[PDB]
Design a protein around this ligand. Structure first.
Ligand SMILES: CCCCCCCCCCCCCCCCCC(=O)OC[C@H](COP(=O)([O-])OCC(O)COP(=O)([O-])OC[C@@H](COC(=O)CCCCCCCCCCCCCCCCC)OC(=O)CCCCCCCCCCCCCCCCC)OC(=O)CCCCCCCCCCCCCCCCC
Ligand SMILES: CCCCCCCCCCCCCCCCCC(=O)OC[C@H](COP(=O)([O-])OCC(O)COP(=O)([O-])OC[C@@H](COC(=O)CCCCCCCCCCCCCCCCC)OC(=O)CCCCCCCCCCCCCCCCC)OC(=O)CCCCCCCCCCCCCCCCC
Ligand SMILES: CCCCCCCCCCCCCCCCCC(=O)OC[C@H](COP(=O)([O-])OCC(O)COP(=O)([O-])OC[C@@H](COC(=O)CCCCCCCCCCCCCCCCC)OC(=O)CCCCCCCCCCCCCCCCC)OC(=O)CCCCCCCCCCCCCCCCC
Ligand SMILES: CCCCCCCCCCCCCCCCCC(=O)OC[C@H](COP(=O)([O-])OCC(O)COP(=O)([O-])OC[C@@H](COC(=O)CCCCCCCCCCCCCCCCC)OC(=O)CCCCCCCCCCCCCCCCC)OC(=O)CCCCCCCCCCCCCCCCC
Ligand SMILES: CCCCCCCCCCCCCCCCC[C@@H](O)O[C@H](CO[C@H](O)CCCCCCCCCCCCCCC)COP(=O)(O)OCC[N+](C)(C)C
Ligand SMILES: CCCCCCCCCCCCCCCCC[C@@H](O)O[C@H](CO[C@H](O)CCCCCCCCCCCCCCC)COP(=O)(O)OCC[N+](C)(C)C
Ligand SMILES: CCCCCCCC/C=C\CCCCCCCC(=O)OC[C@H](COP(=O)(O)OCCN)OC(=O)CCCCCCC/C=C\CCCCCCCC
Ligand SMILES: CCCCCCCCCCCCCCCCCC(=O)OC[C@H](COP(=O)(O)OCCN)OC(=O)CCCCCCCCCCCCCCCCC
Ligand SMILES: Nc1ncnc2c1ncn2[C@@H]1O[C@H](COP(=O)(O)OP(=O)(O)O)[C@@H](O)[C@H]1O
Lengths: 49, 347, 121, 99, 459, 320
């Protein structure tokens, strides 16, 4: 208890932490799925495979 | 001002600009301009004082005159063509009137005095919103009507804007007037490239908006409105001074920063059309802007001006309000040169 | 304006259906890596401005910065590649359609070509 | 007076606090190791190894190859009575003058 | 070239993550390692350059300059150790970051394969130098020096950008290989004259040329030791490299437009040597000597003969090393007595023998004592100028005489005579300073032993 | 959450929390009087919160740990030196006066924030409105200069034009000889070195300027020492007075919201206290400023934001 006043950022905002981690994971998985779908669509359209 | 009223007025300004940018009817575009001005005046007069009232009065007079000229041009175009759709105007006199009205709205020379006057009169947030949005809209109108623009008149106004901005920025000491003259010079560059590539115009608009947002938000963070007030920032938060210095370097067109990309692309586009003298003069004239940018950077970052005694209490206390997207605007205004070919996406 | 008004252009469409015939950018693209680097720099600048340990505080928000920049950069790269492909397609089509405006020229060897010699002295 | 300014400090001498100072740092151990790494790396590694590397760099400029080719051409030319140096670099038969 | 580029971009995070008392050690060690790695670029071919990729290529002209830059970085680090003892950790790291960024930009500028990328990087080098000067200079005139430097460079270089974009639109590509193979003669018209003027004037302002050179004394006198070392040794050679690169597309108009610049350069050699004869400041003397040597390089490039390019390259390398050594010696003397006046401190040979030896060697190399590469380059340039015309020999002879005069004058003034009685803070020379001088001087003698590595691509 | 436009939209209105005892009872008084005891008595009886008189280490107290900092890092002024050598050539007198004015402005901002966020009244021993009496006393004796007076006036105007007026000049009118007797009895040598003319100038400034000025704005309740001994009479008089004085009757919810936003941001409160006016007494050289700032950053719990200092025991830094 160094500070006489409780700092606004004294404790982690677990709601914000969870939202940030979930958003990052969701964006990464969505990007990977979109890339896979784009690769498959390109191959199908151009007849490569 | 009530927060609900303030956000309603801001949304009304944005809705007027959106109506201008999405309307295919001259009457609807004029309506959008009128709504934008009407909702913009209280934003200027938020912090009530005689200087703010005078700035709002001058802004209202200028915008009302420009709107009357624009409506006259619309009526003249309707007389000789009977068309309301915004396309290549069918009458040279109407086109000249429209160009003059839009130049007056933007702030191009010789219609530039109200820009520093109002910018000094109003606060930092009001100046930021004014510059950004009130230059965003008429540039959209000009891009829509680009193919009928008289190149001689447009380039004359652009070069005059560049020269006047450079000299005014050289002589001024107030931060808001410096920002106003910088805006004048950048609008001159944009309107110079306008009759050749609206894509380059939009690219310059985006880069200028990003840099202006970064600079104004840094000034708001440091709570400085003069050169000497900014000269004390190094003793409280030296990071902000360094960020402001790199932003000022970028705004001057120095490579390899983001500000060099619009000038480079504009020079390339203009020299594609067998125009060399205009790009050469425009490039040489930006040295005045870089000079007053560097002079401002000397007083804040590269040297240490004397401080005061209550700055110790300033150190003891901490900044509370957090700026939104400030790091993103700082990064985008200095480190996006290797991403230049995205102008094809912007096309 | 050059590209606007092109026939078949659907307004307010970031990526039309014809853009899916092009190779999507690789996830290891140097441009994507540079976008992630910009995101990381923005996170560091955020820490510096808000007066937090620059390299050790706010790891979750730094990761969010990097992820958002990578996502937007990927979509921007897709649009840029589509636009350049469209430009090349239109150029080749016009060259094919106007052979009299784009004619083939005779290729003379340097033995046949006469060029002036300027001594350096 | 015009400011509350600190007086100009006297310059510190590294030899006062450390007679064996190498001039790199005021900390004795850090100074000693800075001197050691500078001397070792720079002098030994860079000078000696780079000098011998440059001395024994392979002959990619083809100086010796050019000398051998010149010797071969001179021998062939003077053995058959041909001029040592040709009059023209290219073939007048292949060159078509404009006329 | 990525094997050299990436280690610098790794020097940056290493510097920012190293401990407070290990920054100098880490930076010096890894800069020396990077220099050793960059030594491999000296294995050039005889006919065509080394084309690593579509973006970077190395030539017999680029390789010695890259080696010089990578070798010059750790010496600047040592000098910064010397003069930045009381600075804070963050500011010291910022100074090292500026030096690292400048080195990286110089490497990319020298290895760039296209003229527009070359211009972008060659202008990008301005920011770190301006920051270093105007932030860590010691006197009031540093702001004015920075302004003069920046605006001279930009006023020179903007028409170069206009000319480059025009050339790309006209021809198709700015790639150096393409513009060399597809080169066509330049007609004698006003438009071609002005394009020639744009390009040449940009590189001449960078060089500098006599009459466009005041920024050089202003910036070199007021800059810190590392800034002076990088300004004189490498940043002055950007103009020479550009001229040796850009003149491919300017013929035969260069045979007609070279007269004003040749006369300016020769009379500038004479005038700047005469100025060196009567200078009360040591740094100003060194700066004007640099101006004279760069004017000689200008003469070589403008006469543009195969014997003049080799001399130009050799003289550029030799002058860079010699000027860096001279600036280091002057900075040591300044840090001892806190004044740049030359006649203030005397008897320094009595007080400091080894520094007197270093001064003697540096002044002998400055006046082109055979068989040093300074003399090799100067003699090649003189022979080419003699072939060009037979009065250039007179001008070169008088310039050489005055050069020897002022070099030995500064040596005798600083080192010989009776020591100043009231100066009693002349401490013995540091091992760091002695090692700095030795590392400056030994490569000169080694390049004298092996001179074919710095004679350019026309060897 | 933190107060702001979102809270105002949601409905956190200041006039809702206001009551009859929600009054900023500044108690203005004289030197070495029973004003401190009287203020403490008034605060307890009326249920209000008492603010001890503002000072250098009061400004040091609110931030970080409550313990005071070194005088070099905070204030750079001392009251003892002003007592020992009032006319010293280092400008300590005006430096102390400006620092004390800044401290009182900060204290008034804190009191306004507490009142507008809790509805409880506040009792201040002295305020920025009555702080000019010391400046006038110094100027009459020649301790400070006309330039110092002008700078103080400019700062006072631009910084006190914003906040609401005080509530009562409880002028504990003690004659100067009695003040000197009390000072002698207290036994502190530094205050024993106070001259009689300096004490008279403060009383002249109070009675001729401050008392007439605040009479128009609000009621002024003047009491002698014996009258101030009976705090119940003072409380009864305070509760009795009722009128349309001051801007408080016409204060609105929007004005209260603006005032609360202003007072909750301390850097905006202390914004014009460092205007670029280069008086030799307050101007600090660049090198000294840099060195002192480096020391202040080297302080234990002040290098980063409060929630991000590992050396004072902050955890979860990487997730915060
Ligand atoms: C913890 C970390 C976790 C993540 C780690 C990385 C994960 C991915 C690893 C991986 O394998 O990635 C694959 C990917 C390479 O895959 P690839 O397809 O084989 O690429 C090979 C060729 O590059 C392919 O070349 P190309 O022909 O495809 O085109 C290459 C190049 C062609 O263009 C160029 O060469 C021009 C580049 C410069 C343009 C701007 C110059 C002027 C402005 C400079 C300063 C700007 C502000 C800063 O264009 C680009 O790369 C476009 C984007 C450029 C961004 C980087 C350069 C600009 C900034 C330079 C700063 C110095 O890896 C990288 O790109 C890594 C590069 C960075 C490594 C880290 C160290 C820093 C190096 C800096 C070099 C600067 C030059
Ligand atoms: C892979 C390589 C990538 C290289 C990228 C290079 C470009 C980066 C651009 C973005 C940089 C963001 C920096 C944010 C601010 C940080 C400031 C700070 O305190 O930093 C200290 C901070 C820790 O100290 P602290 O105690 O937390 O902070 C102390 C306080 O600041 C309290 O200290 P104070 O307040 O007492 O300090 C006073 C200082 C306060 O002022 C500053 O510190 C401002 C410094 C400049 C920040 C703004 C830069 C904006 C962009 C400029 C771009 C120019 C061209 C760059 C071209 C780059 C080409 C590659 O002000 C002054 O000294 C006044 C005079 C100022 C003179 C002019 C300074 C500005 C020059 C402008 C150019 C600078 C370029 C380099 C900047 C590097 C910054 C770290 O360390 C870092 O930030 C280190 C960052 C880098 C390493 C991160 C860890 C990496 C570990 C894994 C490595 C893996 C490698 C392979 C994979 C790589 C994947 C990415
Ligand atoms: C002024 C007196 C004067 O003419 O002195 C000539 C004299 C050079 O001796 P010269 O060889 O007898 O003069 C040229 C021959 O008469 C005739 O030479 P040419 O027949 O071989 O034709 C070459 C002539 C072809 O003629 C033209 O191009 C005529 C049209 C010129 C258009 C304007 C050029 C603007 C940019 C110039 C540089 C600005 C910086 O080139 C020029 O005129 C180039 C003019 C610029 C030379 C470089 C000046 C650098 C700064 C000097 C210090 C300034 C302080 O000094 C200068 O040129 C510098 C004067 C500085 C004042
Ligand atoms: C309902 C619809 C959704 C509304 C969402 C907003 C919150 C509404 C509730 C609320 O709290 O309202 C009161 C809240 C502030 O109330 P206040 O206490 O009267 O404000 C005091 C200061 O003016 C507050 O200003 P400050 O001095 O504290 O900070 C400066 C502030 C000043 O911001 C403003 O004045 C509003 C924005 C003006 C334009 C900003 C630049 C836009 C550039 C666009 C470029 C082209 C794309 O600007 C920023 O913080 C960053 C500006 C934007 C940068 C990024 C722009 C690109 C994205 O209202 C706003 O923040 C206005 C938001 C308007 C949103 C319109 C959406 C359509
Ligand atoms: C640093 C400055 C750049 C800032 C970048 C951020 C600016 C805001 C970006 C917002 C992106 C929103 C995309 C979401 C879908 C929008 C779809 C629609 O609105 O626009 C589409 C795409 O158009 C957008 O303008 C393209 C968005 C490109 C955003 C990045 C621009 C980068 C410019 C180069 C800067 C260097 C890169 C820096 C890294 C970003 C289709 O437009 P379309 O109706 O059919 O064409 C006619 C309209 N005209 C007249 C304007 C042409
Ligand atoms: C003692 C007094 C000294 C001062 C006075 C001098 C008096 C004369 C002293 C002479 C001493 C040396 C004589 C014996 C020389 C033996 C070595 C010499 O023969 O080799 C030279 C070679 O020396 C090296 O090449 C010198 C290296 C120079 C480069 C060093 C760079 C180190 C990094 C520093 C970077 C500096 C950057 C500067 C820009 C590049 C010449 O090349 P070469 O004879 O055929 O090599 C033979 C190998 N072969 C047969 C396979 C070809
Ligand atoms: C300096 C004062 C004089 C220079 C002022 C610059 C203003 C421009 C004046 C010269 C413009 C020359 C020009 O436009 O033509 C050049 C030509 C135009 O020909 P086209 O029309 O495209 O086709 C042929 C038509 N039959 O374009 C080019 O060659 C490209 C390069 C031209 C760039 C302009 C030249 C600028 C002059 C360079 C001087 C540099 C001075 C350096 C200052 C140093 C200060 C320390
Ligand atoms: C269009 C505008 C979008 C703005 C999004 C961000 C919110 C508004 C601005 C807030 C101030 C900026 C700095 C934010 C970080 C520092 C403050 C902090 O601690 O924020 C905590 C917050 C936690 O994250 P969380 O609440 O989970 O956000 C996702 C919710 N769905 O942390 C965050 O939310 C961090 C978010 C970082 C976002 C960076 C900016 C967007 C970058 C997108 C990539 C493209 C960039 C190019 C330009 C835009 C193109 C569309
Ligand atoms: N603005 C000011 N300028 C100079 N000195 C001040 C100022 N305000 C307060 N002081 C000093 O603070 C001290 C406060 O003492 P005080 O609290 O009145 O004593 P007591 O607690 O016995 O009533 C006084 O001695 C006075 O000199």
């Amino acid at each position: 208890k160094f500070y006489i006043r409780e700092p606004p950022h004294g404790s982690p905002d677990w709601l914000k932490v969870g939202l940030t981690l979930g958003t990052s994971v969701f964006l990464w998985i969505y990007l990977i799925k979109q890339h896979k779908e784009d690769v498959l669509e390109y191959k199908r359209r151009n007849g490569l495979e | 001002m009530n927060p609900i009223i303030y956000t309603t007025l801001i949304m009304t300004v944005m809705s007027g600009t959106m109506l201008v940018m999405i309307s295919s009817h001259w009457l609807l575009i004029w309506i959008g301009f009128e709504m934008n001005l009407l909702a913009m005046i209280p934003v200027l007069m938020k912090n009530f004082n005689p200087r703010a009232t005078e700035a709002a009065t001058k802004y209202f007079l200028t915008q009302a005159t420009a709107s009357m000229m624009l409506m006259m041009a619309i009526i003249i175009n309707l007389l000789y063509s009977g068309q309301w759709t915004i396309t290549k105007m069918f009458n040279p006199v109407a086109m000249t009137m429209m160009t003059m009205a839009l130049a007056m709205k933007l702030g191009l020379s010789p219609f530039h005095f109200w820009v520093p006057e109002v910018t000094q009169g109003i606060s930092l947030q009001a100046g930021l919103l004014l510059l950004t949005w009130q230059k965003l809209a008429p540039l959209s109108v000009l891009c829509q009507i680009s193919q009928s623009i008289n190149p001689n008149l447009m380039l004359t106004m652009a070069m005059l804007s560049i020269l006047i901005g450079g000299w005014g920025g050289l002589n001024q000491t107030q931060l808001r007037k410096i920002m106003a003259y910088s805006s004048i010079a950048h609008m001159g560059w944009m309107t110079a490239v306008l009759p050749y590539n609206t894509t380059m115009t939009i690219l310059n608009l985006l880069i200028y908006i990003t840099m202006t947002l970064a600079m104004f938000m840094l000034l708001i963070h440091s709570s400085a409105t003069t050169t000497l007030s900014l000269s004390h920032t190094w003793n409280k938060m030296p990071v902000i001074t360094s960020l402001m210095m790199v932003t000022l370097l970028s705004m001057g067109g120095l490579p390899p920063l983001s500000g060099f990309m619009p000038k480079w692309m504009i020079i390339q586009e203009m020299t594609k059309n067998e125009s060399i003298i205009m790009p050469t003069l425009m490039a040489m004239t930006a040295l005045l802007n870089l000079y007053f940018y560097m002079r401002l950077a000397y007083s804040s970052s590269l040297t240490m001006f004397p401080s005061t005694n209550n700055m110790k209490m300033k150190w003891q206390f901490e900044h509370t309000k957090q700026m939104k997207l400030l790091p993103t605007m700082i990064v985008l205004s200095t480190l996006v040169l290797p991403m230049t070919p995205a102008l094809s996406s912007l096309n | 304006t050059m590209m606007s008004g092109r026939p078949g252009r659907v307004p307010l469409q970031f990526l039309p259906n014809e853009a899916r015939s092009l190779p999507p950018p690789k996830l290891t693209d140097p441009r994507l890596v540079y976008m992630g680097f910009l995101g990381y720099c923005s996170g560091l600048i955020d820490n510096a401005i808000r007066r937090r340990p620059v390299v050790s505080a706010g790891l979750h928000r730094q990761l969010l910065y990097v992820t958002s920049f990578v996502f937007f950069g990927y979509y921007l790269l897709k649009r840029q590649d589509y636009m350049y492909a469209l430009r090349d397609h239109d150029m080749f089509a016009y060259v094919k359609s106007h052979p009299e405006d784009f004619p083939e020229k005779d290729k003379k060897t340097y033995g046949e070509i006469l060029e002036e010699f300027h001594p350096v002295r | 007076i015009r400011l509350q300014e600190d007086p100009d400090p006297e310059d510190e001498n590294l030899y006062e606090k450390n007679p064996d100072s190498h001039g790199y740092d005021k900390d004795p151990i850090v100074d000693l190791w800075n001197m050691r790494v500078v001397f070792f790396f720079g002098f030994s590694i860079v000078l000696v190894l780079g000098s011998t590397f440059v001395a024994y760099l392979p002959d990619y400029r083809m100086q010796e190859w050019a000398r051998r080719e010149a010797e071969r051409l001179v021998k062939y030319r003077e053995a058959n009575g041909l001029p040592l140096m040709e009059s023209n670099c290219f073939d007048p038969n292949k060159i078509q003058l404009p006329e | 070239m990525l094997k050299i580029i990436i280690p610098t971009t790794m020097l940056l995070p290493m510097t920012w993550m190293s401990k407070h008392n290990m920054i100098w050690i880490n930076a010096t060690v890894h800069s020396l390692l990077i220099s050793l790695i960059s030594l491999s670029l000296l294995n050039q071919l005889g006919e065509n350059s080394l084309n690593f990729s579509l973006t970077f290529f190395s030539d017999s002209l680029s390789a010695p300059l890259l080696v010089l830059t990578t070798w010059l970085l750790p010496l600047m680090l040592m000098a910064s150790q010397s003069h930045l003892s009381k600075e804070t950790t963050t500011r010291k790291k910022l100074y090292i970051t500026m030096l690292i960024l400048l080195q990286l930009f110089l490497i990319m500028t020298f290895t760039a394969t296209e003229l527009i990328l070359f211009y972008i990087l060659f202008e990008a080098t301005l920011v770190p130098t301006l920051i270093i000067i105007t932030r860590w200079g010691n006197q009031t005139e540093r702001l004015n020096a920075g302004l003069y430097f920046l605006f001279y460079t930009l006023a020179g270089s903007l028409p170069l950008l206009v000319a480059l974009v025009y050339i790309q639109n006209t021809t198709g590509s700015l790639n150096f290989l393409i513009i060399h193979y597809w080169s066509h003669p330049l007609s004698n018209s006003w438009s071609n004259i002005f394009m020639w003027l744009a390009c040449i004037m940009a590189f001449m302002v960078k060089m500098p040329l006599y009459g466009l050179h005041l920024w050089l004394p202003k910036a070199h006198v007021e800059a810190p030791i590392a800034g002076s070392m990088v300004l004189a040794a490498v940043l002055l050679k950007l103009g020479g490299y550009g001229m040796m690169r850009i003149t491919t597309i300017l013929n035969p108009l260069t045979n007609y437009m070279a007269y004003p610049f040749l006369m300016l350069s020769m009379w500038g050699m004479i005038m700047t040597s005469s100025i060196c004869l009567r200078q009360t400041d040591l740094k100003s003397l060194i700066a004007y000597s640099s101006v004279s040597h760069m004017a000689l390089v200008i003469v070589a490039i403008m006469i543009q003969t195969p014997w003049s390019f080799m001399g130009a390259t050799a003289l550029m390398i030799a002058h860079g090393l010699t000027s860096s050594m001279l600036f280091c010696l002057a900075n040591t003397n300044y840090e001892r007595v806190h004044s740049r006046t030359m006649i203030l401190a005397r008897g320094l040979q009595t007080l400091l023998p080894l520094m007197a030896t270093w001064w003697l060697v540096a002044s002998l190399t400055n006046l082109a004592l055979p068989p040093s590469i300074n003399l090799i380059g100067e003699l090649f340039i003189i022979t080419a100028s003699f072939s060009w015309s037979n009065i250039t020999i007179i001008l070169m002879g008088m310039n050489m005489m005055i050069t020897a005069l002022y070099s030995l004058y500064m040596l005798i003034t600083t080192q010989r005579g009776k020591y100043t009685h009231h100066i009693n803070n002349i401490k013995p020379s540091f091992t760091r300073e002695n090692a700095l001088m030795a590392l400056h001087i030994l490569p000169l003698l080694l390049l004298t032993l092996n001179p074919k590595m710095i004679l350019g691509p026309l060897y | 959450l933190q107060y702001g436009p979102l809270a105002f939209v949601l409905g956190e209105r200041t006039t809702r929390k206001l009551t009859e005892t929600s009054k900023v009872i500044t108690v203005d008084g004289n030197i070495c009087s029973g004003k401190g005891r009287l203020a403490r008595e008034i605060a307890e009886k009326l249920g209000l919160r008492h603010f001890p008189e503002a000072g250098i280490h009061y400004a040091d107290s609110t931030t970080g740990d409550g313990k005071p900092l070194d005088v070099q890092l905070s204030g750079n002024c001392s009251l003892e030196k002003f007592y020992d050598d009032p006319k010293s050539n280092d400008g300590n007198s005006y430096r102390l006066q400006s620092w004390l004015y800044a401290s009182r402005l900060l204290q008034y901002a804190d009191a306004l924030e507490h009142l507008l966020s809790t509805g409880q009244g506040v009792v201040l021993e002295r305020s920025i409105y009555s702080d000019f009496v010391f400046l006038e006393a110094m100027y009459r004796q020649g301790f400070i200069r006309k330039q110092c007076v002008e700078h103080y006036n400019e700062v006072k105007k631009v910084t006190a034009c914003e906040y609401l007026p005080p509530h009562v000049v409880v002028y504990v009118d003690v004659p100067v000889p009695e003040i000197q007797s009390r000072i002698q009895k207290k036994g502190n040598p530094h205050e024993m070195k106070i001259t009689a003319a300096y004490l008279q100038d403060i009383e002249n400034a109070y009675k001729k300027t401050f008392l007439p000025e605040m009479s128009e704005k609000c009621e002024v309740l003047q009491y002698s020492a014996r009258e101030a001994e009976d705090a119940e009479k003072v409380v009864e008089d305070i509760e009795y007075l009722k009128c349309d004085k001051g801007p408080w009757p016409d204060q609105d919810d929007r004005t209260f919201h603006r005032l609360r936003m202003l007072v909750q941001n301390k850097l905006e409160v202390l914004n014009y206290t460092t205007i670029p006016v280069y008086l030799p007494e307050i101007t600090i050289g660049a090198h000294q400023s840099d060195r002192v700032f480096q020391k202040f950053t080297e302080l234990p719990g002040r290098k980063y934001s409060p929630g991000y200092n590992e050396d004072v025991g902050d955890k979860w830094i990487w997730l915060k």
